[PDB]
Write a protein that binds this ligand. Structure first.
Ligand SMILES: *[C@@H]1O[C@H](CO)[C@@H](O)[C@H](O)[C@H]1NC(C)=O
Ligand SMILES: *[C@@H]1O[C@H](CO)[C@@H](O)[C@H](O)[C@H]1NC(C)=O
Ligand SMILES: *[C@@H]1O[C@H](CO)[C@@H](O)[C@H](O)[C@H]1NC(C)=O
Ligand SMILES: *[C@@H]1O[C@H](CO)[C@@H](O)[C@H](O)[C@H]1NC(C)=O
Ligand SMILES: *[C@@H]1O[C@H](CO)[C@@H](O)[C@H](O)[C@H]1NC(C)=O
Ligand SMILES: *[C@@H]1O[C@H](CO)[C@@H](O)[C@H](O)[C@H]1NC(C)=O
Ligand SMILES: [Ca+2]
Lengths: 49, 480, 49, 480
């Protein structure tokens, strides 16, 4: 079950407040799997986090 | 004639031991220890728990600068006199602060790298890694004084540093602080208000020095903070206790006389070596006791040359003593002192190895030397293979675990780690949490192969030749 | 405790202010398993799953 | 036959072992540990976490005198906590004081060192490191009493101490404290007001003693704080328990009989040695057991002489137990107790080693002893070379890492650090950062050469000797 963290730091806070407002992480889940990517142009390297 | 050379070698040993006795003075480790504890261990703030050794962000650097740094630099004025104007600071009521500390930075240029055209919309700014060809040489921000204007290396009288990530030049954007805390703090606050450390800064240096008139021994302190292109902060430091006013006491005159005697000894040794080589034994190199002689002579000549070079070039102290409200540039002296210390250390190490030529007096000591000389060739032959396998393991570890373990981040670090594994000085943790497969396999195979096979092979090689030599000598003695 | 961490260090990191080239917004995909997890009964603190 | 000498040696060993077990006693370690926890671990004040072990400034030392010292010296047995109807395990230190503690300081004089004339316009005071020739012997401050007037060593009954940095004499400016807390605190506050620890002070001693009133053993406590000429504070401590009350029950009267038996045994051994040295093989020192009984005899004579001296000086302690108006000088008793303990330990070790002479009966033990004795000249000859290389490496390490590691601060420290490196107890985190080059080279070359070559050679010598001895002993049998 995927959930996007908005686009800017104005709606992401509301998205969170929704996520812990309607018990998205109830006592049934197993993992949260927070994942994102990063880019460094100075060395030209990507990084999967 | 096994006696003319023995006596003049014991005299050389005595002179060398006297030379290093005064070179490595006592109550000097405590001085550097106190300075290091004062500067690298005091927390940046009362409510903070980080110090200079564990800086983690550019915001922590600003907390350290206007903070634990000014506390250790500008100590109290111990008010018991008139205190006419801006009294000087004694760091431990004994350590005088010479001149005034200097801060400087090295940064790069905005148009340095070349981001790809595919995503040239969401990426607007980029700064390449530090290099001379990619350095900023233009005024930035409030182009008012010397902290916002580039000033070439020749104008700072500086030189390279060879830090951790790269080799930084001697130029950059610098600023000389004030002699009192209430003004240095104001200058640092003014620097911080309008941003001085942007995202394009690559390095920052802070330099000063102290005297400690009790025991005549200067001390130069340098602190470097490196900002890599990938983010983060890397701190480094050095505290060099150098001496510049040698001839004050009789013991220094004794040391000078000993140095003169050492120079005469080196001259005699080189003259006798060249006299031997000029007419006798034009090949001369198949003994292993003549390469050592030329190595010792070359190292001693280099040490004497370095000492003369760094003793004649002490005009910086004379310049500083004229105007004492200026930054004293004492970095070249510390660098040359370090080089001279290294050369002296290796020379002293090699002389004691040369000592081996004379311990052959009794029969029970002849067989050991004979065994060593007979087994050296085979030991080298097997050491070639040992080193080849060791380097293969090191390169495999570097390529596999070299990006996550922090113990294999460099080929040299891999070599040191593999030597430490033999000591049983390994934790077995970061290897296995780095990779559950090929992690323990590498460790197990390395330990098994290396220890068992190669250590036992070395033992067999030495034991067989020792037994052979002993049996040969016993048979020869019993048959004669 | 995940939510305070995400609100304090994650969201200012992904958005920032002229920092952290992201190359794709983050995601929070999670697995459900649709069963209520039984709390661990007290004992020797077993290290199983 | 040798059976009679075997019986005599076993009787002597039994007497020595029972005497040592009797004098070792018990729960002395717990008393010393409680003393250390009480006087060293408690913070100087509730608002600070700096205990006596971590002193770092003169003001901290001043805070300790009114803080942890007094709060723990005057009836700190307060059972205000949850004691179970009696004093608990921790609280058993009622510790009645034996009179008054004494404080003393050693300082130098202004002008002990000559500052260079170039800096002479900037610096006025020069205090040298501590030395007997540079000590100050002049009154200072409110010159009214004994705290501001120099007193010679003879008038104070002092002695050298051999501190961490230097060896301090027995003179100095001293003050005898009082019995009650509220007046000792006032005296110390008066000392602090009129500054007593100036820039010229180099050492400070605090001395006292206790009895504990319930386990029957005195305790002598000395605390030293020495300020190096480079600024800072170095603390050290010495707790010595004593038990000179040796006539209470029937148990300790048996030790008198044991001492008499030991004296008779020593006299018998002395007369046997002096009779056998003369008539039979004058200068018989060729063998090992012949040169081992002399050492035992000499050490036992020294031990019994020291014990007699202690018994004679016991009477100097008892005459003032109800008198608490004079400082009890118990330093000599503690020093001689330590000397006696060391001598007893060494002589017990040598007596235990002497047993090897008797277990040579059967073929296995005799063969092992013959093998051990045959590989003695070779092992010594190779140990000479091993230690030559060891000292060369140690000197190189001392020259390179002598200022910024603290494991190679002194030559003996370098030797012990190398010995621990052989055990794989190295840090290597500070070695690499102290010198990025010539640092790792030391470690790698030392580990490789040392382990491989030298350990293999040590093993090979013993292996060859054992093989030769077994072959010889097999050939000498079944061939006659
Ligand atoms: C850096 O250069 C880029 C284009 O190369 C430009 O968009 C950006 O505004 C520049 N930044 C500064 C601070 O000059
Ligand atoms: C810039 O220089 C002017 C010179 O008149 C000075 O008044 C001002 O304080 C300076 N501003 C700084 C250093 O921020
Ligand atoms: C650099 O050397 C010159 C030449 O003597 C000197 O005048 C100057 O003060 C030194 N320092 C700087 C920062 O220019
Ligand atoms: C120390 O002695 C020098 C020698 O003349 C003198 O100038 C200085 O005032 C003295 N300082 C003190 C504190 O006595
Ligand atoms: C000095 O004189 C006596 C000690 O002999 C003492 O009672 C007195 O208070 C002292 N005077 C001052 C000013 O400390
Ligand atoms: C030193 O010993 C003598 C011996 O009679 C004694 O009178 C004197 O008081 C002692 N010194 C001190 C400071 O107690
Ligand atoms: Ca005997």
């Amino acid at each position: 079950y995927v959930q996007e963290l908005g686009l800017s730091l104005e709606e992401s806070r509301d998205r969170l407040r929704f996520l812990q407002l309607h018990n998205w992480l109830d006592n049934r889940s197993r993992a949260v799997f927070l994942e994102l990517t990063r880019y460094s142009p100075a060395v030209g390297l990507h990084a999967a986090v | 004639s096994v006696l003319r050379e023995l006596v003049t070698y014991l005299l050389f040993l005595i002179v060398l031991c006297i030379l290093t006795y005064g070179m490595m003075s006592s109550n000097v480790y405590y001085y550097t220890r106190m300075m290091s504890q004062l500067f690298l261990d005091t927390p940046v703030s009362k409510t903070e728990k980080t110090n200079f050794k564990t800086l983690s962000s550019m915001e922590d650097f600003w907390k350290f600068t206007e903070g634990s740094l000014l506390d250790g630099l500008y100590w109290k004025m111990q008010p018991s006199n008139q205190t006419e104007a801006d009294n000087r600071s004694f760091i431990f009521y004994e350590n005088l602060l010479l001149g005034v500390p200097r801060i400087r930075q090295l940064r790069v240029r905005n148009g340095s790298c070349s981001i790809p055209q595919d995503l040239r919309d969401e990426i607007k700014e980029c700064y390449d890694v530090y290099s001379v060809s990619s350095e900023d040489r233009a005024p930035f921000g409030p182009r008012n004084g010397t902290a916002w204007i580039y000033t070439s290396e020749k104008d700072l009288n500086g030189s390279s540093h060879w830090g951790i990530i790269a080799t930084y030049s001697g130029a950059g954007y610098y600023l000389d602080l004030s002699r009192t805390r209430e003004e240095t703090a104001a200058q640092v606050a003014s620097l911080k208000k309008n941003v001085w450390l942007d995202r394009g800064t690559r390095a920052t240096f802070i330099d000063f020095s102290v005297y400690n008139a009790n025991i005549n021994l200067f001390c130069v302190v340098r602190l470097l903070v490196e900002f890599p292109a990938t983010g983060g902060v890397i701190p480094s430091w050095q505290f060099q206790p150098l001496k510049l006013i040698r001839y004050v006491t009789t013991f220094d005159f004794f040391l000078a006389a000993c140095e003169i005697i050492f120079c005469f000894f080196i001259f005699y040794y080189v003259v006798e070596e060249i006299l031997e080589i000029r007419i006798h034994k034009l090949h001369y190199f198949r003994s292993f006791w003549n390469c050592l002689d030329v190595v010792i002579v070359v190292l001693s000549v280099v040490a004497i040359g370095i000492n003369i070079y760094r003793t004649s070039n002490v005009e910086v102290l004379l310049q500083f003593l004229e105007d004492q409200n200026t930054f004293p540039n004492f970095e070249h002296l510390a660098y040359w002192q370090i080089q001279f210390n290294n050369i002296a250390a290796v020379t002293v190490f090699f002389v004691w190895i040369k000592l081996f030529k004379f311990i052959n007096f009794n029969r029970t000591m002849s067989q050991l030397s004979t065994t060593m000389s007979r087994c050296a060739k085979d030991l080298f032959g097997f050491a070639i293979m040992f080193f080849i396998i060791f380097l293969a393991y090191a390169q495999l570890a570097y390529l596999v675990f070299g990006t996550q373990v922090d113990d294999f981040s460099t080929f040299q670090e891999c070599i040191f780690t593999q030597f430490r594994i033999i000591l049983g000085d390994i934790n077995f943790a970061e290897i296995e949490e780095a990779n559950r497969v090929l992690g323990p396999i590498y460790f197990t195979t390395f330990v098994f192969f290396m220890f068992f096979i190669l250590l036992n092979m070395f033992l067999a090689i030495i034991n067989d030749t020792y037994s052979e030599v002993k049996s040969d000598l016993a048979q020869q003695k019993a048959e004669m | 405790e995940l939510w305070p961490w995400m609100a304090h260090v994650l969201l200012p990191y992904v958005h920032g202010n002229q920092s952290s080239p992201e190359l794709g917004p983050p995601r929070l995909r999670q697995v459900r398993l649709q069963e209520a997890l039984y709390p661990d009964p007290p004992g020797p603190r077993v290290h199983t799953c």
